[PDB]
Amino acid sequence: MFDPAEKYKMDHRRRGIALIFNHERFFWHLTLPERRGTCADRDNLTRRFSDLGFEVKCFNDLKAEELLLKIHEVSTVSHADADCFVCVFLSHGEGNHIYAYDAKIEIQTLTGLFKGDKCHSLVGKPKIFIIQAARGNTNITEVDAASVYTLPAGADFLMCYSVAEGYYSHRETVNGSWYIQDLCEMLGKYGSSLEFTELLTLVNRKVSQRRVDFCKDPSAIGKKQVPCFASMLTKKLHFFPKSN
Amino acid sequence: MFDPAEKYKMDHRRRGIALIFNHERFFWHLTLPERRGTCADRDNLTRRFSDLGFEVKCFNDLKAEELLLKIHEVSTVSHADADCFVCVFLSHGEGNHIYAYDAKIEIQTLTGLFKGDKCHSLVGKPKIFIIQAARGNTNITEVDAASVYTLPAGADFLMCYSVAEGYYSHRETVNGSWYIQDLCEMLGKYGSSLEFTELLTLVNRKVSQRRVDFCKDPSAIGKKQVPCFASMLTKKLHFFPKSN
Ligand SMILES: Oc1cc(F)ccc1CNc1ncccc1-c1ccncn1
């Protein structure tokens, strides 16, 4: 009965929710820099995910408690009538942690709320996390060292990462993160036609190909960016237009 | 002219080398169990990779020095005339380490030898690592806890993992590892037709779907296996049959 071309069923009434936690500033006593440009990331993502049928819900500079409450809320609501779930972190991170405004949170505990154990309505449905996080140091290009582990999650999770270990994350202070720029461009051109990992692969090409030989800053030279993704998907994932 | 359907060029004279480091026993003073069944993994892989045009080269129970010498050898030979490179570890691991016979080796240092910097002949060519490693506990099913970090590598690397964090790796003592059985079956049916990550996705479905409710051992119940992969590929990867 088994089928090599099998797709996730993307014919539910609604596409689903895209959460976007967007962190620009941080509590003084953490000594983390402003992520100038993250608002371009937030806006570009919000548009592209809207266009694919997502109920996008942004949240600027939440503290740990607020963030946990919001994501727990979304986990316990029924996704019975939904194709999939997307969650995006634009912040600083270290190891297995993302930074809220006031403290770091274990990525494991955020992804764990959708494990299908904990959230029955999303069993057998794609759960995509996109993470644009790294180490805190007119349109300048600021450069952070990779810091967030390229963790997997569980069955039917796709974890997507701005940068792999050893490489470097770039953010233009007006245009935003290189990862998110190229992601959003490819979503723009291909989101509705291409399989999502085929697209994520295009993003890897586009970001790896960005030249870093002749740079305005002398010490940003030879700092290449290579993003990855960790698939535990079990079927092809397409965001074909849902019919009106 | 940027192209969403673009493929790695797989028209070089030879397909390339598949290394297989296969560890069954270990130095007494490490206190690691025999991996009974790993020979089925080694043989099944050897066949399937042969059939796709690979010069397969197996190495049973090498010590650290021997293993490093062998893999460094293969890194410094010219791959100019080759499509790609495959390297497979069947052993125990912990964190960012694989076990040789006598001691553990940093996966980073093994994958590092093929980073475009260090190995010019493989720049722009797929470098696939397949890792069937976990924590040391007629045809019995032995069950190990996930232990090896699902690390990325660099540009044009595909890292493939038996099991993700939190889940469990299964090995039948005659048929071999669940990961490798389902990988080899899918290679058998689809290797030559399907795109390789499409296939790795089928392997994720097949392994996640293995029932663990009614088990011979009482304490092996509810121990699910979900394998992942970390793509930093930049093009589609096909193993179409080569002529002559
Ligand atoms: O993925 C697994 C699998 C396990 F069995 C156990 C733990 C992890 C955590 N993942 C990581 N993934 C990718 C890069 C690094 C880590 C990392 C690195 C340093 N410390 C902790 N983690």
Numbering used by the authors:
A (entry chain A), B (entry chain B): 30 to 166, 187 to 293
Show me the paper's own sentences about this structure.
Here we studied 30 congeneric ligands that each present a distinct heteroarene for stacking between tyrosine residues at the dimer interface of procaspase-6. Complex X-ray crystal structures of 10 analogs showed that stacking geometries were well conserved, while high-accuracy computations showed that heteroarene stacking energy was well correlated with predicted overall ligand binding energies. Here we employed a congeneric set of molecular glues for procaspase-6 to study diverse heteroarene stacking on tyrosine side chains under physiologically relevant conditions. As a model system, this protein–ligand interaction exhibits desirable features such as a shape-persistent binding site, a conserved ligand binding mode across diverse analogs, and the positioning of the probe heteroarene at the terminus of the ligand structure.
To confirm that binding poses and stacking interactions were conserved across analogs 1–30, we solved procaspase-6 complex crystal structures for 10 representative analogs spanning 3 orders of magnitude in measured KD value. Importantly, all 10 structures revealed binding poses almost exactly analogous to that adopted by 1, with the probe heterocycles positioned in apparently productive stacking interactions with tyrosine 198A and 198B. The significantly improved KD values in the progression from pyridine to isosteric diazenes (1–4) and finally to triazene 25, for example, was fully consistent with guidelines from the Stahl2 and Wheeler16 groups that increasing numbers of heteroatoms lead to more favorable stacking with aromatic amino acid side chains.
